[PDB]
Short mmCIF file of C-alpha atoms and ligand atoms in Angstrom, two decimals:
data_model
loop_
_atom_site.label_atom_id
_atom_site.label_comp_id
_atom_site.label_asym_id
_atom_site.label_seq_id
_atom_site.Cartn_x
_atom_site.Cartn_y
_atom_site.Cartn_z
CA UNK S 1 0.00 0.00 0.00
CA UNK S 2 0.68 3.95 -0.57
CA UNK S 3 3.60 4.86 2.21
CA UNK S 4 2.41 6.59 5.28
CA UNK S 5 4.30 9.53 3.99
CA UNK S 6 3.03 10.14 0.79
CA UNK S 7 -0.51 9.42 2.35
CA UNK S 8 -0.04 12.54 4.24
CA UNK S 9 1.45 14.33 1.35
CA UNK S 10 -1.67 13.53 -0.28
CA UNK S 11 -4.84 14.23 2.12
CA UNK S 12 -2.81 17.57 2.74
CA UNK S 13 -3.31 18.38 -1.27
CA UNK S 14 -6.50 17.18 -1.94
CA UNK S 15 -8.11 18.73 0.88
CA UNK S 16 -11.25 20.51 -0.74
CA UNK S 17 -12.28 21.97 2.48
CA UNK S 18 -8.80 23.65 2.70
CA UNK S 19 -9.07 24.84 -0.83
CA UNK S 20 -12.57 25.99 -0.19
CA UNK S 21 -11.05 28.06 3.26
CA UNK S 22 -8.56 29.97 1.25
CA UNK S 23 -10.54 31.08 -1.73
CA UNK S 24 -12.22 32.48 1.08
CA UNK S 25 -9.33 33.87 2.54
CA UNK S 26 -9.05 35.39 -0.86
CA UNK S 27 -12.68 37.01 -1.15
CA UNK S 28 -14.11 34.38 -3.19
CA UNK S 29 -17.65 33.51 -2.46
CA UNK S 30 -17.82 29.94 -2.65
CA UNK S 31 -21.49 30.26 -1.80
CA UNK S 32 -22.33 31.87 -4.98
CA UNK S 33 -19.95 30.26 -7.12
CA UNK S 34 -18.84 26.69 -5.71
CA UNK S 35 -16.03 24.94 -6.59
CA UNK S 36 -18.04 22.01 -7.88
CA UNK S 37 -19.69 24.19 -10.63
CA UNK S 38 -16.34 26.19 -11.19
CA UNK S 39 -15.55 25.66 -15.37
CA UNK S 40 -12.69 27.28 -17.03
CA UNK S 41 -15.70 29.23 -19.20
CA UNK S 42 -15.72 31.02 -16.45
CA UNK S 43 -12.07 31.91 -15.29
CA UNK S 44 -11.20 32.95 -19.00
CA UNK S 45 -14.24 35.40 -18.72
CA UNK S 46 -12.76 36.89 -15.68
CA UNK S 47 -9.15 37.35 -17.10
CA UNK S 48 -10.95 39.35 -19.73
CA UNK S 49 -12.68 41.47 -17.23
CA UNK S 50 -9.06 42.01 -15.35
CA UNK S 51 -7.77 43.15 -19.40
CA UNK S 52 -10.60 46.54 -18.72
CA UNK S 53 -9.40 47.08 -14.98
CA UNK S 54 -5.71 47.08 -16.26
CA UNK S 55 -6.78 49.60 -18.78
CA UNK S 56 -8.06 52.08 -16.38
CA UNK S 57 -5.13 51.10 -13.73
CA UNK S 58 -2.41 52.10 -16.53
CA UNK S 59 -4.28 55.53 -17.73
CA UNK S 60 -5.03 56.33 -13.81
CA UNK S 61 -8.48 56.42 -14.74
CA UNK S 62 -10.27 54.91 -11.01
CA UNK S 63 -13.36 57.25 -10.54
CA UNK S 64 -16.95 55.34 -11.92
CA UNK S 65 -15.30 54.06 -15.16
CA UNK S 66 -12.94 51.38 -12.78
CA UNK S 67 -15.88 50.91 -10.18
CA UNK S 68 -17.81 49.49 -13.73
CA UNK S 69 -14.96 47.64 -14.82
CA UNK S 70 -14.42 46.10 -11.08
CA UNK S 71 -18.45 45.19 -11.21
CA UNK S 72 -17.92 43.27 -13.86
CA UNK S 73 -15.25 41.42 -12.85
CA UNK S 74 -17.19 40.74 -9.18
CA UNK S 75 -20.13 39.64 -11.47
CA UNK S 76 -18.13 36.74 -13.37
CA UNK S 77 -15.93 36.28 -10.49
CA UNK S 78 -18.40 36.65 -6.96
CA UNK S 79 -16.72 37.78 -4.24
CA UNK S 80 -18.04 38.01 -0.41
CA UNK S 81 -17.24 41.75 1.11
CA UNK S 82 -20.24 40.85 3.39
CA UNK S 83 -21.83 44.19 3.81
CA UNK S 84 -18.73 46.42 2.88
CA UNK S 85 -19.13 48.70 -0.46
CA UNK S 86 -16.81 46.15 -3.05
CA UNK S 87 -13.35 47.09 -3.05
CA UNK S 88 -12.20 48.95 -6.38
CA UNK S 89 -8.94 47.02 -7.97
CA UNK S 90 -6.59 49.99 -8.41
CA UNK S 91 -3.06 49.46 -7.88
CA UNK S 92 -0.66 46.75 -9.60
CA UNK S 93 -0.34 44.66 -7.05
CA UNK S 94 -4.43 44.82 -6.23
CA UNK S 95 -4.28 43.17 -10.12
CA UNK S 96 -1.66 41.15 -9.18
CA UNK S 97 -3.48 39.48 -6.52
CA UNK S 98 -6.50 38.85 -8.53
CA UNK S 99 -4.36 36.98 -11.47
CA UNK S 100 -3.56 35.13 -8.44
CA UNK S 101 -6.96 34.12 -7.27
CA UNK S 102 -7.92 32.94 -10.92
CA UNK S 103 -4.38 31.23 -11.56
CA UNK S 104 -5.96 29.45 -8.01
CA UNK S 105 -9.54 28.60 -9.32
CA UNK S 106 -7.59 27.25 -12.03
CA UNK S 107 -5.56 24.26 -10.05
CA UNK S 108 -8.78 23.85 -8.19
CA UNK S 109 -10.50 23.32 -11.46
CA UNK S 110 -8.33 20.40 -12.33
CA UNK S 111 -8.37 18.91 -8.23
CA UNK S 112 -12.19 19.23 -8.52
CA UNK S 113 -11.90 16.54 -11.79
CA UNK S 114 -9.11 14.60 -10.04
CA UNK S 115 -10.19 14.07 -6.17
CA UNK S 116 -13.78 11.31 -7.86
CA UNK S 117 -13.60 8.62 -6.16
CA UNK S 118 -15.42 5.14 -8.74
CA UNK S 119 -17.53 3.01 -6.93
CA UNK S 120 -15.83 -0.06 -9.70
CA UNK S 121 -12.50 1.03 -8.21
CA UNK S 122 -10.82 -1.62 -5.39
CA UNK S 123 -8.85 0.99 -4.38
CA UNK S 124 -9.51 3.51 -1.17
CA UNK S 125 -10.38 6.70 -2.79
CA UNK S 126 -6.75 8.50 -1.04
CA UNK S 127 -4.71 5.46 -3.22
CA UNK S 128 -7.60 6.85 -6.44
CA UNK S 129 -6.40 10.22 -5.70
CA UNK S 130 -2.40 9.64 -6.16
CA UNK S 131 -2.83 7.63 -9.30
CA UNK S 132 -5.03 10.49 -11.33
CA UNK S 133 -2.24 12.36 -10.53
CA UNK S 134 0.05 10.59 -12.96
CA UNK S 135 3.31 11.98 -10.57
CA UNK S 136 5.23 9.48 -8.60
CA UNK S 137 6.10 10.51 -5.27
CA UNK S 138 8.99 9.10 -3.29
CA UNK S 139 9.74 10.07 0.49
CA UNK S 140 13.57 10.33 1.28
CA UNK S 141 15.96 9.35 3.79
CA UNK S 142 16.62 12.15 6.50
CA UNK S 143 20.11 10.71 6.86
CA UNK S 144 20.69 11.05 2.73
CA UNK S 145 22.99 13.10 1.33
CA UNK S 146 20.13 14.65 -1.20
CA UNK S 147 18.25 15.69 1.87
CA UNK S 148 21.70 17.41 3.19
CA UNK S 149 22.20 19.20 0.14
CA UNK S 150 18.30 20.24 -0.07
CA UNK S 151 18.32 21.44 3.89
CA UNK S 152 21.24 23.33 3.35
CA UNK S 153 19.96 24.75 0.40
CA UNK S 154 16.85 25.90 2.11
CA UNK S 155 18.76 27.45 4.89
CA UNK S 156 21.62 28.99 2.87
CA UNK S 157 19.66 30.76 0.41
CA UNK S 158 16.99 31.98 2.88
CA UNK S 159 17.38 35.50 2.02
CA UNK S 160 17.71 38.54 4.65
CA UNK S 161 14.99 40.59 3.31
CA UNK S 162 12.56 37.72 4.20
CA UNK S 163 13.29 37.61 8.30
CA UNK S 164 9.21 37.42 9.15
CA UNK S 165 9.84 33.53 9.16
CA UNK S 166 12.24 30.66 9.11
CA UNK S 167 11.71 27.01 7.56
CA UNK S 168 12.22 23.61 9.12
CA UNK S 169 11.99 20.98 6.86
CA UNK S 170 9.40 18.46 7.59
CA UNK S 171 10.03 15.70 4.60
CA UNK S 172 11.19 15.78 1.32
CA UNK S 173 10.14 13.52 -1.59
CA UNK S 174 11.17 12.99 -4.68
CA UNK S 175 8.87 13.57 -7.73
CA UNK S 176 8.77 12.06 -11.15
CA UNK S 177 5.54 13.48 -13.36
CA UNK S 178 4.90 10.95 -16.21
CA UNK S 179 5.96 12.24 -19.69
CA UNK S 180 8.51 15.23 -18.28
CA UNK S 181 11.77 12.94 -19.01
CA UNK S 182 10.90 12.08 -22.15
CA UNK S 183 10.04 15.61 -23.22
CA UNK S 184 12.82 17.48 -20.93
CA UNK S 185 15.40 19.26 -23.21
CA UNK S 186 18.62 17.16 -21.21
CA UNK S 187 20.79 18.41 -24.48
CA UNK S 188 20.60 22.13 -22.95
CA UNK S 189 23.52 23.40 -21.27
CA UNK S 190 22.81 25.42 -18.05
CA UNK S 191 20.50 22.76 -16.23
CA UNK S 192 19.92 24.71 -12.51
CA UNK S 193 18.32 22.63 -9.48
CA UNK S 194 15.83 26.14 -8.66
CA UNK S 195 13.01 27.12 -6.23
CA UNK S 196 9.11 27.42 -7.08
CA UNK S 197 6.38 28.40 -4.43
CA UNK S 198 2.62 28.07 -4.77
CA UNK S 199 -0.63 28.53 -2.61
CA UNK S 200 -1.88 24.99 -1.01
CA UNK S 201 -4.92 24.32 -3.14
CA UNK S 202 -2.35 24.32 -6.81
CA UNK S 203 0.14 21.35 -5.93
CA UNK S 204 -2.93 18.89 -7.51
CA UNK S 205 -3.08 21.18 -10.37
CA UNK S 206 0.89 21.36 -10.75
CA UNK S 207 1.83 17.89 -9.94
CA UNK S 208 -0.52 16.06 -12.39
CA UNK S 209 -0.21 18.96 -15.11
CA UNK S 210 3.26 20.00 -14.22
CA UNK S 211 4.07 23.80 -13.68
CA UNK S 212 2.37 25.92 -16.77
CA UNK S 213 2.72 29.10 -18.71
CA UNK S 214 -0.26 31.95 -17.58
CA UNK S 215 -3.84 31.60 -19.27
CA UNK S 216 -3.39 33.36 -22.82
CA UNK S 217 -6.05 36.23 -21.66
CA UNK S 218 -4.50 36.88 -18.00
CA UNK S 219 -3.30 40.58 -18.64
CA UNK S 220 0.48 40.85 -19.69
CA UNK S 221 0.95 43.16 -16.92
CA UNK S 222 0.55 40.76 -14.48
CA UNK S 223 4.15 39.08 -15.77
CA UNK S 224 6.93 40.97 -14.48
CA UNK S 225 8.88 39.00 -17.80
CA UNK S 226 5.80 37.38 -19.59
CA UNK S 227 4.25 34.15 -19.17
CA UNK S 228 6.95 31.70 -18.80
CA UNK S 229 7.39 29.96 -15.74
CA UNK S 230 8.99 31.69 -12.94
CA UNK S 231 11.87 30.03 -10.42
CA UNK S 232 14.41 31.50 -7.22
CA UNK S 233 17.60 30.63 -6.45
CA UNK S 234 16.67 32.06 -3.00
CA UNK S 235 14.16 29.48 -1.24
CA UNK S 236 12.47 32.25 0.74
CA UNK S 237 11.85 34.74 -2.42
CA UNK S 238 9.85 31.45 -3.93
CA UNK S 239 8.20 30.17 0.04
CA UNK S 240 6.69 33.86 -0.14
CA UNK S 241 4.23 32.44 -2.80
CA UNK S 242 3.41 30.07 -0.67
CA UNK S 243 1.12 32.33 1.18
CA UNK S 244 1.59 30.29 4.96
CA UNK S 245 0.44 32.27 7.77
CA UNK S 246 0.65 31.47 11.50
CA UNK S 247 -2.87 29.59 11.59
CA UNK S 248 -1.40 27.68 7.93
CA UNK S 249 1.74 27.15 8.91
CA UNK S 250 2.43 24.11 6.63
CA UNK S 251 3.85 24.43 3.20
CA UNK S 252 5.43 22.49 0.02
CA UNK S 253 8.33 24.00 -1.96
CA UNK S 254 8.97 22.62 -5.12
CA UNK S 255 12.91 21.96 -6.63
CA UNK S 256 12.79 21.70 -10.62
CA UNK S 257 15.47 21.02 -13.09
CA UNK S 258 15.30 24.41 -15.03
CA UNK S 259 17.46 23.87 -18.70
CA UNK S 260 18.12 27.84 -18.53
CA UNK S 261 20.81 27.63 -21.70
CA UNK S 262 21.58 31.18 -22.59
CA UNK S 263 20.14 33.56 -20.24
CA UNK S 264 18.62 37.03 -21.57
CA UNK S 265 19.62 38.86 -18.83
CA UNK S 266 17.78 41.66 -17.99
CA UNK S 267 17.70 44.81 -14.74
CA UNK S 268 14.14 45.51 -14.51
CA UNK S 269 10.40 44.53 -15.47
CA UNK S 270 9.52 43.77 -19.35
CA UNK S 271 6.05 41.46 -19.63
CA UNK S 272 7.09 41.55 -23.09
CA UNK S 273 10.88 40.09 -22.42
CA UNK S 274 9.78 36.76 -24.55
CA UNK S 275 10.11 38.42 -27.89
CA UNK S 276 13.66 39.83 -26.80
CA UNK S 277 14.61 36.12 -26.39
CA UNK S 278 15.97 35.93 -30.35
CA UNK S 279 18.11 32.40 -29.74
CA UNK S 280 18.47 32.43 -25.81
CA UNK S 281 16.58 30.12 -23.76
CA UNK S 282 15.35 31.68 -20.93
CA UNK S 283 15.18 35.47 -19.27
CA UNK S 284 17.33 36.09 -16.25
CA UNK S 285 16.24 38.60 -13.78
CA UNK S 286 19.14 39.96 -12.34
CA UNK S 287 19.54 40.55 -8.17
CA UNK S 288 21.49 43.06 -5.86
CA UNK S 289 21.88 39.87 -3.97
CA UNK S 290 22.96 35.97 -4.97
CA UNK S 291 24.92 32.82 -4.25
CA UNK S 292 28.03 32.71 -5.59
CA UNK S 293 29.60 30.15 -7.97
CA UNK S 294 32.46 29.26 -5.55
CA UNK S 295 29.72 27.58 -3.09
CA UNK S 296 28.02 25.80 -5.92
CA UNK S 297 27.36 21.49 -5.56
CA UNK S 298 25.87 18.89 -8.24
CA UNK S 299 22.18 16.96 -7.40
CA UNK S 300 21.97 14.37 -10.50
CA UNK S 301 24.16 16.58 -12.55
CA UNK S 302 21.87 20.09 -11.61
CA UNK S 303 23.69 22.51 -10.55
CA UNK S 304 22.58 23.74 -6.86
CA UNK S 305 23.10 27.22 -6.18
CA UNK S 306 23.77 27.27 -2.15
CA UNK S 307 24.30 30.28 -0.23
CA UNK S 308 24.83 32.62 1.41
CA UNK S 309 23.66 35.10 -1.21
CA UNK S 310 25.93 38.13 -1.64
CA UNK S 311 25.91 41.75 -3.23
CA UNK S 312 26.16 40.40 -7.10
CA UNK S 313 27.15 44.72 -7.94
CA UNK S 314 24.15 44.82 -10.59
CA UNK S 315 22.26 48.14 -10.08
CA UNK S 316 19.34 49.27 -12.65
CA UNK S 317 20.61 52.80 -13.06
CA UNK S 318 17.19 53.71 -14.63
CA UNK S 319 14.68 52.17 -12.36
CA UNK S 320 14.33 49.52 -9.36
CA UNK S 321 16.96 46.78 -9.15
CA UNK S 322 15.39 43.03 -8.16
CA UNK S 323 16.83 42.35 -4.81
CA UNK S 324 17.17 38.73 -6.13
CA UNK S 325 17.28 36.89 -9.82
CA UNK S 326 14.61 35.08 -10.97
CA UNK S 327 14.32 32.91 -13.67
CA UNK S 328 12.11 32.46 -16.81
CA UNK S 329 11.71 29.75 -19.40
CA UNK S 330 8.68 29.97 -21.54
CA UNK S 331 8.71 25.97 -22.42
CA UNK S 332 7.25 23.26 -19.82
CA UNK S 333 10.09 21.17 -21.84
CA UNK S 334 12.92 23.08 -20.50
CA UNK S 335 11.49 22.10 -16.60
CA UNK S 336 11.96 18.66 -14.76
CA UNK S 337 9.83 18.37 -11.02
CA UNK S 338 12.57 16.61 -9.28
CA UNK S 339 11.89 17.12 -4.88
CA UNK S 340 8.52 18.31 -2.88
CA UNK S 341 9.42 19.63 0.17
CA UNK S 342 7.19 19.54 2.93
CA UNK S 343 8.35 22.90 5.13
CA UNK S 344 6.94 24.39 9.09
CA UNK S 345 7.08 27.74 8.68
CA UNK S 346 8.04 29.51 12.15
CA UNK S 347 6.49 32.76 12.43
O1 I5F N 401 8.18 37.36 -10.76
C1 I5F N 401 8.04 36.18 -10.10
C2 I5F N 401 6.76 35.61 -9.95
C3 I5F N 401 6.61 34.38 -9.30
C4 I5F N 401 7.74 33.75 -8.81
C5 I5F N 401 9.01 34.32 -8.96
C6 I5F N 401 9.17 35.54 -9.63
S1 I5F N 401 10.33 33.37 -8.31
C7 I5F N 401 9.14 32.24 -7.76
N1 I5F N 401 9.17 31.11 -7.11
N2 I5F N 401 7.85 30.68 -6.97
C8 I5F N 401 7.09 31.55 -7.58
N3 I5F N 401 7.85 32.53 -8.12
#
């Protein structure tokens, strides 16, 4: 039978009730709009009606044109204020965190399918769960020297920006999705062991459909270097998307194989940076702050970037400078899920 481990892993990620509790967290009105009648129909209308709010965000027209655009958007997305006048969307981040809540609804879309139990099945429905999600999950030794290299690269690359929390790690597994070795580009030189954080209720959604490029109508803005998919070498820059809090203290960071090749390497924000690719292989971000290629170790032939991060001398001169790379490719090929890390965060 399924490990005792991975058992855990799994009632933790297909927890609908959990997944119900932080779309409500998020505003969402499950009430109105459940999660069993949630289509992607209706999450591609709602990117559309974020398109008109970004319109009026980027002219700094708010005022009764936004509050119309906003209405919409509450309409084909409901939302519970309880009694307080709806909340205009007005500020970058405001959009941001509404991209967020549909790139959400969309992983719970594809849990809703996944977590049906058949009454022909022999199995117990937890054991129906794991296979529909076509990802084999492996727990590791403690005493390994993977999980030595993984702790310390949690701990190193904790960054010192990020001192509201620290992370203990709980368990680590190993993950092999069906299909992403065969279609991984191994021939690419720059292969990078790298960070990805995500909200509770999308690790069903990214572990049977692997990590994905943004809906096509999501609002370019919303993609600080387009819609590729995004990595840290800092474990902290990608646990902040984990959203934990004190009463959610429990987490999952995710390590990839990321075939980076040639880096464009840019200083600041362009949601158009995929058409400046012209031969390279993936946009790098550039930090203030990184670890340094003197401290760098080998996991499978990855390179693993441990820390401590230091000043890397990069400065926009023209605008804000990241205060840590990131890391775009804008092909699922070019990414291998490789550990899930199972992390207490300590508030
Ligand atoms: O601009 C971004 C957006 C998301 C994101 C990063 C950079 S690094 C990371 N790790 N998990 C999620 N992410």
């Amino acid at each position: 039978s399924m490990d005792l481990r991975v058992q855990e892993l799994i009632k933790l990620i297909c927890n609908v009730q959990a997944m119900e509790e932080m779309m409500m967290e998020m505003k969402y009105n499950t009430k109105k709009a459940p999660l069993g009648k949630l289509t992607v129909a209706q999450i591609k209308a709602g990117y559309q009606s974020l398109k008109k709010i970004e319109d009026c965000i980027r002219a700094g027209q708010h005022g009764r044109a936004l509050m119309e655009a906003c209405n919409e958007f509450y309409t084909r997305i409901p939302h519970d204020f309880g009694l307080r006048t709806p909340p205009l969307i007005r500020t970058q981040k405001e959009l941001s965190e509404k991209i967020q809540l549909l790139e959400a609804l969309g992983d719970i879309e594809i849990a809703i399918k996944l977590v049906k139990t058949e009454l022909q099945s022999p199995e117990h429905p937890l054991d129906q769960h794991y296979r529909n999600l076509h990802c084999a999950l492996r727990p590791l030794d403690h005493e390994s020297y993977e999980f030595k290299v993984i702790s310390q690269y949690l701990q190193s690359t904790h960054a010192p920006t990020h001192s509201d929390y620290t992370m203990t790690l709980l368990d680590l597994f190993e993950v092999e999705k069906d299909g992403e070795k065969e279609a991984f580009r191994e021939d690419l030189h720059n292969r990078m062991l790298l960070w990805h954080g995500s909200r509770m209720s999308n690790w069903v959604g990214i572990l049977s459909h692997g990590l994905r490029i943004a809906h096509p109508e999501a609002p370019i803005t919303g993609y600080m270097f387009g819609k590729g998919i995004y990595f840290a070498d800092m474990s902290s820059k990608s646990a902040n998307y984990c959203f934990a809090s004190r009463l959610k203290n429990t987490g999952l960071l995710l390590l990839s194989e990321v075939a980076l090749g040639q880096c464009n390497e840019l200083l600041e924000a362009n949601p158009k940076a995929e058409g400046l690719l012209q031969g390279k292989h993936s946009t790098k971000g550039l930090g203030k702050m990184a670890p340094s290629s003197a401290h760098f170790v080998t996991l499978n032939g990855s390179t693993v970037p441990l820390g401590p991060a230091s000043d890397t001398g990069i400065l926009n001169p023209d605008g804000y400078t990241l205060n840590y790379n990131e890391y775009i490719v804008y092909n699922p090929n070019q990414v291998r899920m490789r550990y899930l890390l199972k992390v207490q965060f300590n508030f």
